[PDB]
Amino acid sequence: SHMRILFATVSEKSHLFTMVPLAWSLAAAGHEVHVASNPALTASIKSTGLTAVPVGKDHNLHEMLTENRDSLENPLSDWSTPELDRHSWEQVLMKFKVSVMFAYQTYNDCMVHELVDYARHWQPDLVIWDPVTYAGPVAARVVGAAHARLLWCIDIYAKMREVFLARLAEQPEERREDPMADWLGGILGRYGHTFDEEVVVGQWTIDQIPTSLQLPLSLRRVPVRYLPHNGPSEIPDWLREAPGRPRVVLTSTFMPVADMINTLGSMDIDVVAALPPEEVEALEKVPANTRIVDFVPLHALLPGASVLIHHGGFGSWGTALVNGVPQFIPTIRYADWWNKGTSLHEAGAGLVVHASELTAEVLRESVERLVEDASYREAAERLREENQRTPTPHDVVPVIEELTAEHGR
Amino acid sequence: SHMRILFATVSEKSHLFTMVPLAWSLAAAGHEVHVASNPALTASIKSTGLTAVPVGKDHNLHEMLTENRDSLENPLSDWSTPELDRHSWEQVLMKFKVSVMFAYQTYNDCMVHELVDYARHWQPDLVIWDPVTYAGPVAARVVGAAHARLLWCIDIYAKMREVFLARLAEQPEERREDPMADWLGGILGRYGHTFDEEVVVGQWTIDQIPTSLQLPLSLRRVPVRYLPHNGPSEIPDWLREAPGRPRVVLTSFMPVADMINTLGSMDIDVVAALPPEEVEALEKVPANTRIVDFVPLHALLPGASVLIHHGGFGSWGTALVNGVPQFIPTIRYADWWNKGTSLHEAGAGLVVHASELTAEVLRESVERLVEDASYREAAERLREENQRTPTPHDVVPVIEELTAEHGR
């Protein structure tokens, strides 16, 4: 039965790319699929093959973050351990207040009313939303569409929400406050709708994280296999050529990238570094064992590679995971990046370290360990197999159809 | 079984876009999908979301055509009536000789050896090829991959081949000649492989043309539903407006300026998707007319009354799935004429030769498609026929089974 399906995401390429295979799975089953975001994302959407719907105006989140970068990683932005034991009421309340004020409102308020308008015009049966794109479920609820989160994340968001609600329930009436309900309930109120907790976590969650690495939660979870999409890609000629050393791939206060390259340059390895324009020229000499590129088809590159070094973004994490490649993640407690590192660390499939502790010695030693100690490849291979047993986007299409019939108009 | 699937197409965006939904259906089922063409198509492939594999060098087909332009529509380029009754041996042989020499070799020889090389490296289980991309089945056969045509076309190619083979069989040994076997068999020979007729028509044919509009043929046919993909698209702000009177769309002879002016005088709302310089070749835009460079045709055509176009598959197919009657002033080039006549015979639209298009014919044809409800009704039946065809999603397992049967 033919659906109109609206994908909604904040204007981050990295988030968009995680949604592309599911969007195309639904289009391939005959549904109409439109992808809505701020104008800044329009060009990115259009290169996915999917139809873009520009909504609202662009926001200044990136300028706010870079200009206030020294306040960025602090206890209130750390959602890496969402546990009752670690959160008093006022700690978890304060986390919701600051994340709503600084991140969620900046990302979403710039487009929410235009998204509601588009949903009113187009009448989607289903809205699939990136997990910080709260504009999405608002628009869905206004028109009675079914809606679900599509997760690139270890689900610290829904878990922190569970902690929040447990603490809220302990408070006297006078002390009860919910920044999410105030914000989203406020918007819903203007359109004559009530708040419901399902606008915070979706009616169900479509989850690309393997079950063994995901936080257990009380919500309807539909696992789906992660299929790599890292944006526009082509196969270069040099990809075929075998290097004859363990291949180490690097993708992107803390250890300069120039120094990372030089350390890796001295090692008995082959290095491919996918680095942006200006970082290319911030370096002087390219070591003999090292290739530097702007873009690389990571899924085509990573088969047989020994190590991927990255900051814990899902494209890298997921693509290394499906290729069984051990990961080294020097990162910070931002988004779920730390959880991405620690999940692999605890499973024995990779290594995480705080970015501030990264030195030439730690870099060298960590890489050596991931190359030489076979237990890393073996643990990575187990995770690969877990992903490979998860139903594909293709396979979950009927599940999504049934859930839409159950929950929608 | 997880497959590596290589799509192969000549460097035409219009051909590429017809393959995108099927490519993504297979990727969505967990297969690795790469799309190979000449370097000129790389940017187009990358905007589909699919991984591009540049192979070989660019060809000069378009320069050859424009520099030799006045030979374009001629009896030997007319494959619109591939019937034994209309082809002696020498007529059909001549068509194959000239199409191989001028079109197929130009399109394919520039990349075939590099595609064979890539196939040897990558070892695809399956090659899906655009119907004039004969480099594809060559590369497949060299590595033992299964391979299938994916059709945007009324299948004049396989039907003309059937005519050709019937006439070939009537000839004495000394007079027997096959340009397709010489060309593709020659290339296969270099790699130590034999010619087989399946490199001309595929091991099977995946067909986006509704059965009732397609030529009957003796081959393994897998019908699949056409899903519109017309390249990079966004929804513009103005699309919200309902027009309140019959909407007529025009994409891409009688000068375009005169077409606009005729349609400007009619009791209709007009949207014209026209390229840069044609925009400014006109003086006045009538009150009823909006002119744009790009339009998301699939989003535009719901509720429209008429689409006017030259018979390309993107337009034809997108109008078809929206049940919109079509007016096709065109020429006997590729399958464009068949695209027009198929709809005409079904009573769903009107075809006319482009040379006969006047203000009077334009006006009268549009009026008839708007006023006579039998056109919408016939269009609606074709819409329903397409809608009963299994989707790309639904045919994924069929393609998997056929690959197991026919491949390594």
Automatic annotation (TrEMBL), chain A:
CDD domains: GT1_Gtf-like (cd03784). One of its GO terms (molecular function) is UDP-glycosyltransferase activity. UDP binds at K13, N230, F295, V296, L298. Residues 24-252 form the Erythromycin biosynthesis protein CIII-like N-terminal domain. Gene3D superfamilies: Glycogen Phosphorylase B (3.40.50.2000). Keywords: Antibiotic biosynthesis, Glycosyltransferase, Nucleotide-binding, Transferase. The keyword Glycosyltransferase applies. Pfam families: EryCIII-like_C, EryCIII-like_N. DTDP 2 binds at N230, F295, V296, L298. It comes from the Bacteria. DTDP 1 binds at N230, F295, V296, L298, S316. GO terms for biological process: antibiotic biosynthetic process. InterPro entries: EryCIII-like_C, EryCIII-like_N, Glycosyl_450act, Glycosyltransferase_28, UDP_glucos_trans. Residues 260-403 form the Erythromycin biosynthesis protein CIII-like C-terminal domain. Belongs to the glycosyltransferase 28 family. This is Glycosyltransferase.
TrEMBL record, chain B:
Pfam families: EryCIII-like_C, EryCIII-like_N. DTDP 2 binds at N230, F294, V295, L297. One of its GO terms (molecular function) is UDP-glycosyltransferase activity. InterPro entries: EryCIII-like_C, EryCIII-like_N, Glycosyl_450act, Glycosyltransferase_28, UDP_glucos_trans. The keyword Transferase applies. Residues 259-402 form the Erythromycin biosynthesis protein CIII-like C-terminal domain. Residues 24-252 form the Erythromycin biosynthesis protein CIII-like N-terminal domain. The keyword Transferase applies. CDD domains: GT1_Gtf-like (cd03784). UDP binds at K13, N230, F294, V295, L297. SUPFAM superfamilies: UDP-Glycosyltransferase/glycogen phosphorylase. Keywords: Antibiotic biosynthesis, Glycosyltransferase, Nucleotide-binding, Transferase. DTDP 1 binds at N230, F294, V295, L297, S315. Belongs to the glycosyltransferase 28 family. This is Glycosyltransferase.
